[PDB]
């Protein structure tokens, strides 16, 4: 058994140098890989193991030198496998890749930071090795900006970081397989303790193998495209995993950091530095499966999870709180609770109060399980806490008392962590946002005006809409009753509003209007809210998606503030949502990014005019959605005063593991969010030179021209897209809960942005992310010999431009034109081949231009850590690519017969039997799904 | 400091006494250690003060880690002082000479603290020691190498306060703590058991259990069986709380495990 | 029951059917599910109070000052339209609350219990149309 000698060599060639000398990543992945291959040999035989290993060796050699021979050898081996062995190979490379991501997680989390590698400028904030922690951010604010610690302390007091969890665009992996990955990480880490005992080490190795097999022996398909509730619990897994415990530890570190610069107070417990929001069960844009009952469901489920967690916590709090000296107030309250009732003696008053609150917690949990599992309950209102204040009051009483008796140290222990968990998590953990297209609201209003015989709200001009909406919001007469012809959709909208009306506001964040374009969409949602008897209406949030919507958004927002009814309803607070990927699908990426910068600038000018406090909600696709070090500089790179102590970011499902799976991970996440928000608030990035703004305007025009000319003006583009890319299969298979298009018969316009990105990400081509940069940079470079220098100035001195280019370069590192060409060769008509060839030429050109801008000669020249990690994942992703290409060829072409090879080794008793009701050949559907999940998992995020 | 551990004891048995590893393994199979817990001759300390001492120990130990970070060390010191005051600021008298049941719970604290997790860890270490001398089997799971007994609620010698009702109390309280621990354990056992290849015997039983019933899908049979065992555990615990807090129950005995065999079988 | 009667007469047991079964059927038809049917009765002036509060809250005038025919006209246009008339945001005296809540209680019950809505001191068609409108707009 000396296969280990070979893969070790290959790994050491993939990652040759050392990015430090704790660089045990090759050791980690070689260990996990060898254990895995042994388990694969034991389960599925020797031949299978040798085949898979040969495949990986070739894939790694290809990632090394990129000789197309390696690709054709991988193809040669993969075509000869009967679908059973294809399944085994695909599953093999999925698990090997996951193990690679695991060794990476351990490497990053236990990489010790190097103080001496900092340069002194903003660049350092784009990598976790040189990014500032909380304390370094404090000292940078004090020394360099002459800010006083009191100003920092206030800034922290009023700052709010609101993280919004969304559903996974593809495989939200089984909570069980997450658990198994966790055990594997812990085993690795403990195995690399520099002191461990021989038996501890032996039992750790045994546990590791045991769990790698345990993970391999579980399916990753079948069942349902899990219902919105199942996805929602699968979302809240990370509250038990890390977040619930993680909040108070982070806040305590904020206290320590404040002490270490002279501040003697702590951050007040009720200060909302962290906040969590959810879309799971609320977003309806192009998702009929999110019914009103779904919303009522995840609302009550959230309240259940909250009351449960508080209940399990308050036992340990009651144990801790065994003191007897207390305030007179708390003493009287204890006499009250005891009279109105181990049995909690009156000499332990803290335990009396906390025992009563414990009662209220249990009663609330059972009441919520009865409201969800039935539709009514018997539990009266008084056995439960209805708002957060009733909950907070007795705890704050206990804190007051403890500090009264000089037991503040005791009060700053379990009690403080509990109070902060109550303030951060509320009664619901999260606040659910509802989201819906504007056109559905317009449908409802049109049905209403037609039923009232006033015209059709749809035909009305934007201002006429505004006028009718204003008169209707003014009056005292309700608008409709049950006697209204309601389509299924109209009924969905109205019933959603009623469900909102019949629930506590503690669960609801914002009403987000997708495809928002004009003030009438916002006023419309406000009116529907009031006329559906929504007691405390939600804040309305427009989502300007298309480019023109971004150009006209400040004018619409100003017009909204200028309206007295809205000006008083919003109460000096406004939240606007931007979508990096949504605008990118419309007008290319460069134009969408620059337009977003300008649009935020103008929105801030409007908010300063009308004296409203603006919060910018960053959707998916952004720079702030990459996760990790890059998020630091990305947040720093927002236009000045666009943050102002209120950040709101989408936590994409594809990153939620890299952000909240582990302890160190969650801590560093909350830390970089808080530090970035604070520093940007007190130290805005430089304002751009005007020549820069003009240059970006020209490049935006050229880029949008090329982008739309390719995606929309070329007629055969959609045929090419359907051929060279698994878009249709993703649209058909039980991968995501949402349909891939809004209208089945439309082109790319009606296609959603998630399948648009995902489709081209799968083929290692990434056309939506970089398309447009080539023609623009070429254009300005030819226009003047000097512009290049100017561009290179921006990349090195303008944070915004730097984070944009950096993202593009990183995506190019995840790309490979040769693999794309393989997809073309197997799946595209011959008369369409040159088309693709031309695109690929563009690809290469764009790459060479991006490099020239960054002053780099290789991709990711400045970040060799990331280069190493990407190289390592890629060596696994490439085989999944080829396997996917040929599998597509077989699925689409029943006339393409292959020369099969003999089967290898072992109602379902073998891997091929796990899909009975299959449409295509046995095991092809599952292989395609496997490669899609594996490639998608190995590439993570791009654009 | 110089006493023999398990493995050194093995090598002393094998090298010096010419005992075969098989003889050692058999001896272990048949050996039983029955540890009997008694009430404290004086202060059986409050379970809360146990917890506080525990936090103090953890704080000391982590404070003397040869790698610790400045902020971790500062927060550790703060936690240490905080907990020392916390312990000092609690009384240790009043109330009653705690009822035999109160002393009995205060005895069973140590199952949660260490013993419940500690037993299988030790047994696994016995397995490792057997591997290192050539034995490929493990110590059978149903072998009673460790056994626990109690006098708390049973010893009456010179003690009028141990009434028969006290005995029935500590009996049912013990069973409650047992069913509790098993229940809380079997959730993580159900998470682990997500495999799909299974025995024909297990397949048939799973088809049966699912037919007689997240909703436990039939292609995860282990989760079917263990979810059923979870059901019986819950019913047993609630039944014991009803027999203790009342004197009767409505929950039928057949919804619960009555003997160790019904429990072990699935 | 009628099935049992049909059957008995089918087998020529009509005499048996005309005994306890017939008395039972007649008791069901005479007494229904409620023995009696409850009439509601109220002064017309209370309905006028409610309509006056509504027209004042809508800033249209005071239904009270309006002549009998003008009342008739507003009542007719309102009974014609498709828009409801008011919501919880309405200044309601104790009496107005009594009237509206009475109408809601009528709405939340089976019609088997209710006979007639009787207007005491009835004087003009607007009193009747008014009660009809309040009935509809109270669902």
Short mmCIF file of N, CA, C and O in Angstrom, two decimals, chain A residues 451-452 472 476-481 483 533, chain C residues 57-58 78 82-87 89 139:
data_model
loop_
_atom_site.label_atom_id
_atom_site.label_comp_id
_atom_site.label_asym_id
_atom_site.label_seq_id
_atom_site.Cartn_x
_atom_site.Cartn_y
_atom_site.Cartn_z
N UNK A 451 -63.14 46.90 -10.27
CA UNK A 451 -64.33 46.54 -9.51
C UNK A 451 -65.04 47.75 -8.93
O UNK A 451 -66.24 47.67 -8.64
N UNK A 452 -64.34 48.86 -8.73
CA UNK A 452 -64.99 50.09 -8.29
C UNK A 452 -65.45 50.95 -9.45
O UNK A 452 -66.09 51.98 -9.23
N UNK A 472 -56.56 58.11 -1.64
CA UNK A 472 -57.03 56.94 -0.92
C UNK A 472 -56.35 56.80 0.44
O UNK A 472 -57.01 56.46 1.42
N UNK A 476 -61.03 58.29 4.98
CA UNK A 476 -61.42 57.52 6.16
C UNK A 476 -62.26 56.30 5.81
O UNK A 476 -62.66 55.56 6.73
N UNK A 477 -62.54 56.06 4.54
CA UNK A 477 -63.36 54.96 4.08
C UNK A 477 -62.50 53.78 3.66
O UNK A 477 -61.55 53.97 2.87
N UNK A 478 -62.76 52.56 4.14
CA UNK A 478 -62.00 51.40 3.66
C UNK A 478 -62.21 51.17 2.17
O UNK A 478 -63.08 51.77 1.54
N UNK A 479 -61.41 50.26 1.60
CA UNK A 479 -61.33 50.16 0.15
C UNK A 479 -62.09 48.98 -0.45
O UNK A 479 -62.61 49.11 -1.57
N UNK A 480 -62.19 47.85 0.24
CA UNK A 480 -62.86 46.69 -0.34
C UNK A 480 -63.29 45.72 0.76
O UNK A 480 -62.91 45.86 1.92
N UNK A 481 -64.07 44.72 0.35
CA UNK A 481 -64.49 43.64 1.23
C UNK A 481 -64.34 42.28 0.57
O UNK A 481 -63.65 42.15 -0.44
N UNK A 483 -66.40 40.70 -1.18
CA UNK A 483 -66.98 40.72 -2.52
C UNK A 483 -66.01 41.40 -3.47
O UNK A 483 -66.15 42.57 -3.85
N UNK A 533 -55.66 46.04 7.32
CA UNK A 533 -55.73 46.10 8.78
C UNK A 533 -54.42 45.67 9.42
O UNK A 533 -54.41 45.03 10.48
N UNK C 57 -67.93 61.66 10.38
CA UNK C 57 -66.57 61.16 10.28
C UNK C 57 -66.08 61.07 8.84
O UNK C 57 -64.87 61.08 8.60
N UNK C 58 -66.99 60.97 7.87
CA UNK C 58 -66.59 61.01 6.47
C UNK C 58 -66.59 62.42 5.91
O UNK C 58 -66.20 62.61 4.75
N UNK C 78 -75.34 54.54 -1.36
CA UNK C 78 -74.46 53.70 -0.55
C UNK C 78 -74.81 52.22 -0.68
O UNK C 78 -73.92 51.38 -0.77
N UNK C 82 -69.87 49.46 -4.26
CA UNK C 82 -69.09 48.28 -3.94
C UNK C 82 -68.06 48.52 -2.85
O UNK C 82 -67.32 47.59 -2.50
N UNK C 83 -67.98 49.74 -2.32
CA UNK C 83 -67.00 50.12 -1.31
C UNK C 83 -67.61 50.02 0.08
O UNK C 83 -68.70 50.57 0.30
N UNK C 84 -66.97 49.35 1.04
CA UNK C 84 -67.49 49.33 2.41
C UNK C 84 -67.52 50.74 3.01
O UNK C 84 -66.97 51.69 2.46
N UNK C 85 -68.16 50.86 4.18
CA UNK C 85 -68.48 52.18 4.69
C UNK C 85 -67.58 52.66 5.83
O UNK C 85 -67.34 53.86 5.93
N UNK C 86 -67.08 51.77 6.68
CA UNK C 86 -66.26 52.21 7.81
C UNK C 86 -65.41 51.06 8.33
O UNK C 86 -65.57 49.90 7.94
N UNK C 87 -64.49 51.40 9.23
CA UNK C 87 -63.66 50.43 9.92
C UNK C 87 -63.58 50.69 11.41
O UNK C 87 -64.40 51.44 11.95
N UNK C 89 -61.57 52.48 13.01
CA UNK C 89 -61.27 53.89 13.26
C UNK C 89 -62.55 54.70 13.07
O UNK C 89 -62.78 55.36 12.06
N UNK C 139 -71.48 43.06 7.61
CA UNK C 139 -71.15 41.72 7.13
C UNK C 139 -72.17 40.69 7.60
O UNK C 139 -71.82 39.55 7.90
#
